[PDB]
A paper describes a structure:
One such protein, MRB1590, was originally identified in MRB1 complexes immunoprecipitated or tandem affinity purified with GAP1/GAP2 (21). In vivo experiments suggest that MRB1590 effects editing of several mitochondrial mRNA transcripts, in particular that encoding subunit 6 of ATPase synthase (A6). Structural studies showed that MRB1590 contains an ABC-like ATPase domain, which is embedded between N- and C-terminal domains that harbor novel folds. We show that residues in the basic N-terminal domain are involved in RNA binding and crystal structures capturing open and closed states of MRB1590 suggest possible mechanisms for how this protein may participate in RNA editing processes.
To try and gain insight into the molecular basis for the MRB1590–ADP interaction with RNA, we obtained a structure of MRB1590-ADP in the presence of poly-U15 RNA to 2.05 Å resolution. Clear density for ADP was revealed in the structure, however, only weak electron density for the RNA was found near the MRB1590 N-domains. This likely reflects the fact that MRB1590 binds nonspecifically and with low affinity to this RNA. Specifically, while the initial MRB1590–ADP and MRB1590–AMP–PNP structures largely adopt the same conformation (rmsd = 0.7 Å for 1158 corresponding Cα atoms), superimpositions of these structures with the MRB1590 structure solved in the presence of RNA showed that the latter structure has undergone a large shift in its oligomeric interface. This distinct dimer conformation appears to be the result of rotations originating at the nucleotide binding dimer interface. The MRB1590 structure solved with RNA buries less surface area (2127 Å2) than the other structures, due to its fewer cross dimer contacts. The notable consequence of the structural changes found in the MRB1590 structure obtained in the presence of RNA is that the attached N-domains are significantly rotated relative to the rest of the protein. As a result the central cleft or pore located between the N-domains adopts an ‘open’ state. The average distance between N-domains in the RNA bound or open conformation is ∼28 Å compared to ∼3 Å in the closed state. By contrast, in the RNA bound structure there are no cross N-domain interactions and the pore is open.
Author numbering:
A (entry chain A), B (entry chain A): 50 to 176, 183 to 495, 501 to 526, 532 to 665
Write the structure that this text describes.
Amino acid sequence: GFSPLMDFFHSVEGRNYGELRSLTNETYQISENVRCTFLSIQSDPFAPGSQVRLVCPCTFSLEKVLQTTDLAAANPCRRVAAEDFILRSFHAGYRNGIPRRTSGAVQVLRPSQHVLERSTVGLVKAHQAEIEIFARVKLPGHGRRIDGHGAIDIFYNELVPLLEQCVVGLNEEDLHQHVICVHDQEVLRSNLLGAGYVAFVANGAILPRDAGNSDKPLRDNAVPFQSPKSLECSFTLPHSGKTITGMGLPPGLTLIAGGGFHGKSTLLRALEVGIYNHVPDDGRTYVVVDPTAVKIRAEDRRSVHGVDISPFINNLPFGKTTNFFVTADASGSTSQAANIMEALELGSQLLLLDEDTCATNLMYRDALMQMLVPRAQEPITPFVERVADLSQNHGVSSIMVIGGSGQYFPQARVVLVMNAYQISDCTKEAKEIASNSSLPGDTASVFIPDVNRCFDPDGSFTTVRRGTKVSGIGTESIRFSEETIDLSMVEQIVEEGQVNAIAQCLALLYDGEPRIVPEMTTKGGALTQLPSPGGVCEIQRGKFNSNFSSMIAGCCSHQHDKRLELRTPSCYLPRGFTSATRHIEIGAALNRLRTLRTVT
Amino acid sequence: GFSPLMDFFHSVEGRNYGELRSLTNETYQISENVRCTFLSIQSDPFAPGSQVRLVCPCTFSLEKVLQTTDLAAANPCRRVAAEDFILRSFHAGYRNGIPRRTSGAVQVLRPSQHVLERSTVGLVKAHQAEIEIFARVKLPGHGRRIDGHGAIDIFYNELVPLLEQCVVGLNEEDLHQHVICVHDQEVLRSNLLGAGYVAFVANGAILPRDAGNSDKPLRDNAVPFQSPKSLECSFTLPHSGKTITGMGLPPGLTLIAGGGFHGKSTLLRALEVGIYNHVPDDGRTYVVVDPTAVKIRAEDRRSVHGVDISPFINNLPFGKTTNFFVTADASGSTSQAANIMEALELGSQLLLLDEDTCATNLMYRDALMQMLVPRAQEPITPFVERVADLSQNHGVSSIMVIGGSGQYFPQARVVLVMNAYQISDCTKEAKEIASNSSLPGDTASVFIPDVNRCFDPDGSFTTVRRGTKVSGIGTESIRFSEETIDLSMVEQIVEEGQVNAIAQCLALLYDGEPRIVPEMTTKGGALTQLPSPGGVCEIQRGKFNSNFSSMIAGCCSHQHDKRLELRTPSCYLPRGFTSATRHIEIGAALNRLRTLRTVT
Ligand SMILES: Nc1ncnc2c1ncn2[C@@H]1O[C@H](COP(=O)(O)OP(=O)(O)O)[C@@H](O)[C@H]1O
Ligand SMILES: Nc1ncnc2c1ncn2[C@@H]1O[C@H](COP(=O)(O)OP(=O)(O)O)[C@@H](O)[C@H]1O
Ligand SMILES: [Mg+2]
Ligand SMILES: [Mg+2]
Ligand SMILES: [Mg+2]
């Protein structure tokens, strides 16, 4: 009894392509363990693929893998990891030539090295559990006639063997080990703060990435990571029962110095993605940071609206103000200042900076220049004069790659040096250098944690009313009607599915606007915890808050409640192409909308 | 006898849109002083507009305006300026509501503030001179039927009144003054080097730009430019007979310091566009620099192929080399080093740098850091240790906006300080600061003027053979088949017509490839002069040369000989949408092609 779908396609062979519409909302049993529901049908063969939901039984033990017999009680971190393993096993089927033929007609979201919650694969209650996988399938045509034999080949000779062999026939022991490792990664990260660290870098980690675009670990001539002994510490990982050792970094300022190309940025990049759990053989596994960490850099030409950058830029010429700063075209230093103050507003407790991509004028200032141009005639206060304030008064740590100056040596708690990819702790040497040279707080903090900033939907969106489609373009941008929001320098976005999540939230605001703003604001404001990209709901620290950030957190939480598919009118996406992202990245995107208007 | 075109459109009213093809290559006299030739006809009403050539008599005195009675003998600088004035007068007609109705169907290239040679408007021999203007016109349809009345309205009630009133009826005295001023700008710039300067900034200049996208001068609260007396000098402008006074900058290193937002970058931006003549009321008029000046900045993530960056980055770990450097993903410092060495190869004798957009690690290094990480373990040599070499041994000057360090004070010839938009010469103060502090050449130059670098068309293009359309996207990029060449940080591109010129040259190489490489190389190598963007053919200085740059100069020269319309197979453009660009920007684009391959 698996032939009805084939019998259908045989019946419409050669007929007008429009007649495919009759598949809409029908479900077919196409093999013993595979059902397929058509969620939508392409209007013609050149349109984007028809969306389907494919369903298989869950054949592994829930008790062994998820530690419960009841699916609804399962730890979301383990459920997410299991969905991520199934997704990888599906794609591995293609790589290993499991389909009898590969049509090129099937599109399923391809995961990065990171283990994110995604709408692609769901472990759900059976219609005991089943597995749903969402895909788009280009139903072939000859001109405007249906290629029924071509369609039959896709379903019966491609999707069926893949799902039967790679999903129904998945290796349960590999699945279990994947899920243990991910759960231990998440428990390790969540133990950092309590143990007195902002970051941990496992011994044996392979940090550099291979050549090109795979983001896979460098396969040859890689120097495994080895902690300086002065910083080495050990964590027990309860799910695998293992003990891991590596470099712990304490709160305060850590500097990473060393020659260009000696491994500094590679270490820092592993830290930036340390907010995500990784596939087990990734190399950066158990390299973790505070989940609110934000990569800060210069970003000249971006727009800014209503951000208080007065801690870094103040006293402009001609009474111009920076307490509610607005620009359509930021410089290096003003973009970086705005990036910092926006990250603080969205709650980041750890700033990660790389001198190679910061604005010099915000990083450094030497004594010679101050004699020529006195501080009172220089609007810009460098980060070195604010970094201790952030840390001591607001508990915000900083990790900074540096190479050009020793001006941070006195402020630093730890100074690392990378040389030929080997790391040393050189804190004592640096302090001696600073003390033997000619370098230079119950003082009111310049940082105001109660930020006064509210989204103005009317002013933000009105320009654009003059369908209203919001869509994600790769990982690089969002088209918002005729506007383009450039995300290419929001560096902790790792999957195009996350840009789709962002687009949905921005459209939600557009489609909901008057009442949705206060509602999301109230909802986000009442939250004590937010979902991480790994599906786990963590406690929110830090005193920084604002209506704008609470509103963003409410959107993000609401998208999580809707399983990453908001289905709002102005953002139409095929189902199963969205990946979880922090409310931080959703706010980063709205901050960059060129028509943005905010108000006090 | 002007009704035949109307009679045609009346005859095809309501007929199939395909029948418009019969207009191809026909010419119509649509008023006493206006002819219109259809160069191509849209295949349907949704296609890009049909291209037309519109021709009017030249009614001003050639002798008065161009100083000759024979068009072919006219100075190209004056001919270009006259074409640019006609183009502006045409667009001004729209602004002033001259057409009886504005259909929105007519597209003619819109000039920037700069006076470039363009294929849009030509002063040509009469079929005594006439004026050609190239346009695209969307011939309206109702569904797939011809709207003949709509077309008649465009030609007879829009283009005819515009051309009759604004081109045939142009103000000859305004035209003359435009042409005098432009010619004086060009003569001023070409006199710089001989007089001992690399830049001149006229007194009375208004440098800041108004809010937003117009690039017009700031209309309110602008502080006119006033030279420090120590640098003030005077030039006589022979065409107007006037004498202009302003700040002359001598060869060597000039620093521009002062607080953020006190006017430094605004001065530097006026210098970067000082390679172009400007419309007379622009504000930056008579602000000129060496015509080979290049804006240098950091540009992380660009690709580089076969560039010797060894003067800045050398002695990497593990015998990696930088004498023929290759990367798919440059850092801040490596992109900036490559930008510098590529500009030198293409012949630039003046580097313009803004600290706010440079890579810190290439700009600066202090003594404290050198004690922690000795110079021998640091691949990166900062620009401050190479800037005197460039200047003394190769005659390459530098003008740099700085704010973070006094480390360049000893090397500088001139130190300017901007405060509240007022400028001072503070060279003496800076030198005293450096001498009273603790700061630190028949030495072999590290810079090799005989660059060894050849374009490899086979390796560069082969990937992309797997129509081959090359096109310009605004001023931001070129689509080269499925490749995208990002030009958004090639900052002296000022018109989308220039990106079209670039695209034509790149397609020329693609379409011509084996034999075209040696031919262009030989042609560019033999040139003693190249055409400027203003249409004037200047003498090429400096010893830097390579096969790659000669090849680029040959392409640029050949495009100039073809009046900015190459008509190569892989780059199809409507006629009249191209603007002159230096061979420097054409090479900048090819340098950034991600499949680029070069060879020694
Ligand atoms: N542990 C390692 N083993 C092998 N190669 C490495 C390692 N760490 C970094 N690299 C490689 O060295 C090169 C330069 O590294 P990077 O950290 O960019 O240096 P920096 O940021 O100090 O300029 C990169 O191509 C990187 O992949
Ligand atoms: N001569 C002037 N008159 C009026 N405004 C000016 C002048 N020069 C610059 N400005 C304005 O001051 C602001 C900051 O100028 P900018 O040169 O960017 O400073 P910096 O590069 O020193 O940070 C800009 O908006 C600019 O338009
Ligand atoms: Mg680096
Ligand atoms: Mg960009
Ligand atoms: Mg600036």
